[PDB]
Design a protein around this ligand. Structure first.
Ligand SMILES: [Zn+2]
Ligand SMILES: [Zn+2]
Lengths: 153, 310, 153, 310, 310
């Protein structure tokens, strides 16, 4: 017993699908971790009730397996969303994000006085899970902010 | 080779209790038996991109007393990183090819960290990280505290100045939390409170800490009353209200204080401590400043000399 | 009344049905008209099979009959391209926009010294049938700029 | 109500041959049979967000010769838009309720247009749309070209100097291009050549125009040598090379020029025309500047007067 | 007494091939059998009337590696040539009664030459004669070229920065031109071209040289790519158009080039070289800097030590 959901999707023979993505996060993930330089079939389902009965976002992608490190980097945007690896309509191994030990090269120290705001340096933050929140700490500025205040691209 | 040979000194958050105790141990020794030619053929860079008096002169006198040569600038305004608009990364890449170690102070957080990523295997001693860390200032503090108190654990330490932009309390607090049974008393304006990542560090370690709206209260049982000046230059316009010291120490204030108690202070002061406190026995900010030569003479000798100095 | 044999977007409530074409434009065409907020379905699929003449992508519009004023905000990125917005059920009520001169509140005058930069205005240009190209002219600054120079939103 | 009653005067591009002729018409007799009370109970706003001697004085003077009052500012520096950071839209929005007309010069393009979207029912005469149009100055040129040439059609008009930022040429080309059989000679540095849209408007109408790298090329066949100053204030850094006037006219340069010729130049000049040329019969830049009173007086009269002056 | 003892080092144009090789020869030895006590009782003066990071720091650093003390000033502003209006000649005439050698960088051209007319018997080392020569820099460049190329003759050198005010190329070019069969490739904007006197020299010496509008035109034949910084601070207002680096070197632009090539750059840079080049094997502009220690340490030894530092 493999594929049997009474909902419409567009399976990708040999590809990567990331489901259960919170509203306004699907677009965010395809507009952040840049999932567009791909002359390969990507299907963008936004605000769809495919997984469960809530408003989710689905990113079907052909042969673009994001390593266990590029998936963890999603745990900061859609910690619930699972990510399914599929082998020719014949699915394989599933998974669901794990808070990175760090998030280098993507975010930005919100610190106006931080040094990485003036020199050729790749941004970096040790990821720390806390109570009702995640704490990001520059390797440079050394201060620490809430993932909701750290903007990035 | 000692634990600290060739290592960089960017954050008190990156050293261990042993690393710390090793500096103090060394500092002691050199204070007793000096070694005029220890760093004889060494040439060190004193890079200050922000104002400084003690930190640079205490540091620079420390090199001469270990026979080292000094080269550098005290004002980034007459450098190519000022007139010819060039990056810091580059500035550090070239210097690192002339000197044996780089002592740098910058007005921007994480600037010393940045230099490490460019100074090829050449130690970078963070003089003062913009409002962030200040490893060398904490050593004076420890060496001084243990001097006056005789220990580093089981202390009632109170911190009074601007705790948010106070790079001196950031370090010293992480360091004292590396010793057992230390109790902190944080006094300061709500706007410039002790930064959270620090408080969170205390709870993880389960260290005791409380807040108070006045010195007078904890005055009774504090061994170290560590006051600080208001980092006016790092403040934000929306905080200029705190520009004036909101807590002032007067001789009279030390009427019901313990005897072993001392008043410390990375020193540029501005009325937080009345000049009438200098006559008092509890005064120790200036003496605390003097240990500067020791602490820093110790750090230099452990980072540039493979063997343990005697 | 569609006639399809191979992989293409589904029927919705008042479904559209024609040969759309983003040349890897689809994604930006979402972050240019804000088509990610409407928490209603999203017909998105980049990189799809073409009629053997330059690859293309499809995107109809459900629960929305895009005014015959915004639809013309498409004809400046393809003078001979496509159709959209159809009636209630699965039948066709197509349209093929031309070269509308009015472009309001969407593009910015590239003129470093065009009031439309410091004041609360609403840009507007004039589309021209220029020599081998197409140039626009700010209603305030009156300076002409090729539609290629006004790619900065 | 005449063709121009209560109308905005923002661009020569928005006026017809009839309009211009009408102004000129009016200017004719207004210069002959004055009407010192024509605009007796009107109060006009003189808003100059940019520097100016001629355009503001001839403009305001005009207003008095018609017995009208004036209120305004010659330096946006002491206005609310200036010291309290107020928007222009708001500025015009308030001012439009005090005066009967608004005469504005701004350093930015489209300023006049914008203002028309906020001054309601209030005529907005553009005195200087930063580097763009300058309607009123074009009227002086025509009233002057016609005064010295007898006609405005079938003329060899040369426009030398900065033509890219020269707002004055933008309006005069578009103007003279609304008449029959005119020929143009655009002499200027490549980096500041006559904008394309003006060249295309000329082809669209089939007007003859060529380029030249010197004056002595067209000096023998031109009727109007329209000299201009290089728009420094507006130039872009990468163009500071063209800061100095590249073309210079000397009394000697007119040795083989037509008799019916005149040398025009809105006035801020800087060595584009050596002072020795004022002594020549061809010099007409000051006498043209004087016609500003008449041309501007006429435009005023036309816009605030339903009746058609006689 | 070796060929350069107590001699002044003001202009490459004033030195002979033998002299240069002599420095390079000495530089070599000094990293084989170093002498930390060569100039033990000598005091040198570092007088920088201009900003600097490389030159001044490597220059003093070398002084210490030779056991000599240092006295000077990094900013003429706190001297009396600054606050009390004193001539540069009177400044020299006195410093020359204090130190054993004068090292000066000066904003104006010929200030070094001038100071030799006053510092009786005290060697004047020109550390930066306002946009004219920069002798010491060259010595690195040669020592660097010959380190990576193996030879100083028969080479395809290309100099790409502002060559008009590039005091660094004035010297390297006149220098290399003392060696046999060197080919030059001058890449730069018309306004900032290689000065005539350097071109005229090359001809009367029969040296091959050509201009080019791009780097990738000669990329495949050059052994040395000498990128240089725009001398923004020395430009004339009428050139504020060349302020931006017109030529940029990127990692991509780099590999259809010879193997033995290296990218040399006097050191301050601003986008003339993307930071992504650093990573490539051709990048050498930092190791070129460190070579500053040896070349200069060499020149100091020769001028202040009678016996050829054997
Ligand atoms: Zn930071
Ligand atoms: Zn515009």
């Amino acid at each position: 017993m493999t594929h049997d959901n009474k909902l419409q999707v567009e399976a990708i023979k040999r590809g990567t699908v990331i489901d259960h993505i919170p509203a306004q996060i699907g677009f965010k993930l395809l507009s952040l971790f840049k999932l567009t330089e791909t002359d390969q079939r990507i299907t963008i389902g936004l605000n769809l009730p495919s997984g469960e009965m809530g408003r989710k976002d689905l990113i079907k992608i052909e042969n673009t397996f994001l390593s266990e490190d590029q998936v963890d980097q999603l745990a900061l945007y859609a910690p619930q969303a699972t990510v399914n690896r599929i082998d020719n309509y014949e699915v394989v191994g599933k998974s669901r994000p794990s808070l990175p030990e760090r998030i280098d090269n993507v975010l930005v120290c919100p610190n106006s006085n931080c040094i990485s705001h003036a020199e050729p340096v790749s941004s970096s933050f040790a990821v720390r899970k806390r109570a009702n929140d995640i704490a990001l700490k520059c390797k440079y500025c050394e201060k620490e902010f809430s993932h909701n205040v750290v903007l990035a691209n | 080779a000692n634990p600290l040979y060739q290592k960089h000194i960017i954050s008190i958050n990156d050293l261990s209790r042993d690393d710390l105790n090793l500096v103090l141990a060394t500092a002691a020794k050199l204070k007793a038996n000096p070694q005029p030619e220890l760093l004889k053929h060494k040439v060190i860079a004193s890079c200050f991109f922000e104002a400084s008096t003690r930190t640079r002169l205490s540091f620079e006198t420390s090199m001469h007393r270990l026979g080292a040569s000094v080269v550098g600038f005290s004002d980034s305004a007459n450098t190519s990183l000022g007139k010819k608009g060039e990056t810091l990364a580059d500035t550090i890449s070239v210097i690192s090819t002339y000197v044996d170690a780089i002592v740098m102070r910058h007005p921007q957080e994480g600037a010393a960290r940045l230099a490490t990523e460019f100074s090829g295997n050449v130690p970078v001693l963070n003089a003062g990280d913009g409002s962030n860390q200040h490893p060398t200032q904490t050593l004076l503090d420890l060496f001084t505290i243990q001097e006056t108190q005789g220990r580093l654990d089981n202390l009632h330490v109170a911190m009074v100045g601007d705790l948010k932009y106070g790079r001196t309390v950031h370090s010293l607090t992480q360091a004292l939390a590396k010793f057992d049974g230390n109790r902190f008393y944080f006094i300061a304006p709500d706007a410039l409170a002790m930064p959270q990542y620090i408080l969170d560090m205390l709870d993880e370690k389960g260290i005791a800490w409380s807040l108070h709206s006045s010195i007078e209260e904890v005055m009774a049982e504090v061994d170290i009353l560590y006051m600080t000046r208001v980092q006016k230059e790092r403040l934000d316009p929306s905080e200029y209200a705190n520009v004036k010291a909101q807590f002032v120490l007067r001789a009279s204030d030390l009427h019901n204080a313990k005897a072993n108690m001392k008043v410390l202070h990375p020193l540029p002061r501005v009325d937080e401590i009345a000049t009438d406190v200098d006559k008092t026995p509890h005064a120790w900010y200036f003496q605390q400043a003097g240990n500067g030569i020791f602490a820093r003479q110790a750090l230099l000798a452990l980072v540039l000399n493979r063997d343990l100095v005697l």
